[PDB]
Amino acid sequence: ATFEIVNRCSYTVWAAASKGDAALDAGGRQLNSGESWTINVEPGTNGGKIWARTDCYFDDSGSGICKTGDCGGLLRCKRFGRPPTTLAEFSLNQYGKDYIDISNIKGFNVPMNFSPTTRGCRGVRCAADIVGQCPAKLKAPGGGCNDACTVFQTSEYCCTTGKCGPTEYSRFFKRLCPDAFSYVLDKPTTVTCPGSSNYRVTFCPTA
């Protein structure tokens, strides 16, 4: 499947694509304001994620650090990034269907639109100013808005026992972005697309 990753933000981001134990395509790339990066993702890919990283410094070998979304200091991510990270999530060709969503379960750093470029389903978006409105306790110094599990590490925020309810913190994310997962047991905002659809992820879709 084809994913075009587009940076409409006014600042540089470093895109990342991983299924957690391996890169997807090249795994990561710098995107200046306006730049588009097209990747190919193997059919049948399960648990793939795409996210942006901000304020990165890398050397010639592709090692360095980012203030949000860092994946063990690599330009080309093999694993998932350090929160806060707005997440585009997908599972492809699962019994004839693709499943996509946006998640705030690992916090928020960059606004995002996740849309198909082929027919048959709708896109999803979280483009509110969550960083600007972020509750004091959830603000990450490096930038972004942490989820409450990341910050407080309780069974209730992290849904460790598989039983947990909405919280004052999850409701903040849900209020600003209804179409994204706000906590683990959130009522699913997953979109079902035809198997083998193609997609576009746009950072800063409105501004």
Side-chain angles (χ1 to χ4, degrees):
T2 299
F3 286 71
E4 187 181 53
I5 305 172
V6 181
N7 182 26
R8 191 172 292 156
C9 309
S10 55
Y11 47 85
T12 301
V13 302
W14 287 258
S18 173
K19 60 186 261 295
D21 61 348
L24 300 182
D25 200 284
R29 216 202 82 180
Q30 183 175 326
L31 290 171
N32 293 333
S33 183
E35 286 190 331
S36 306
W37 176 36
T38 298
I39 65 170
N40 294 287
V41 179
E42 276 275 302
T45 292
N46 174 85
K49 300 184 196 301
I50 289 165
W51 69 101
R53 300 166 286 171
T54 60
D55 291 305
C56 306
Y57 295 88
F58 294 107
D59 60 23
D60 296 299
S61 73
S63 305
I65 188 177
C66 303
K67 292 217 202 317
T68 64
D70 188 75
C71 59
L74 299 179
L75 170 59
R76 303 174 220 259
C77 297
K78 267 169 40 60
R79 55 187 198 87
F80 293 143
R82 185 177 192 266
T85 51
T86 320
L87 292 173
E89 304 181 313
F90 50 90
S91 293
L92 308 180
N93 313 98
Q94 303 301 133
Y95 299 99
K97 297 293 184 50
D98 293 355
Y99 299 90
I100 69 173
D101 71 77
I102 293 180
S103 174
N104 286 320
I105 289 177
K106 297 295 186 183
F108 176 99
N109 63 337
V110 171
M112 164 191 294
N113 180 98
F114 191 5
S115 285
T117 57
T118 52
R119 293 130 57 257
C121 51
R122 70 177 189 87
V124 283
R125 177 182 294 191
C126 173
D129 187 20
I130 284 179
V131 178
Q133 301 297 350
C134 187
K137 296 271 189 61
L138 297 186
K139 281 187 158 301
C145 191
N146 286 313
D147 64 284
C149 168
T150 293
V151 175
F152 290 106
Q153 297 280 88
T154 68
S155 297
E156 190 63 19
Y157 296 138
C158 305
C159 299
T160 310
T161 73
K163 283 184 118 55
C164 63
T167 67
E168 210 55 18
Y169 296 123
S170 77
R171 277 185 280 259
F172 158 78
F173 286 96
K174 198 63 170 186
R175 186 177 89 243
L176 273 61
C177 284
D179 280 331
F181 284 86
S182 64
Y183 72 110
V184 174
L185 281 184
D186 207 348
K187 175 193 180 179
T189 42
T190 301
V191 170
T192 304
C193 289
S196 295
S197 294
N198 293 319
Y199 304 91
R200 176 145 43 223
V201 175
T202 308
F203 302 124
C204 302
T206 61

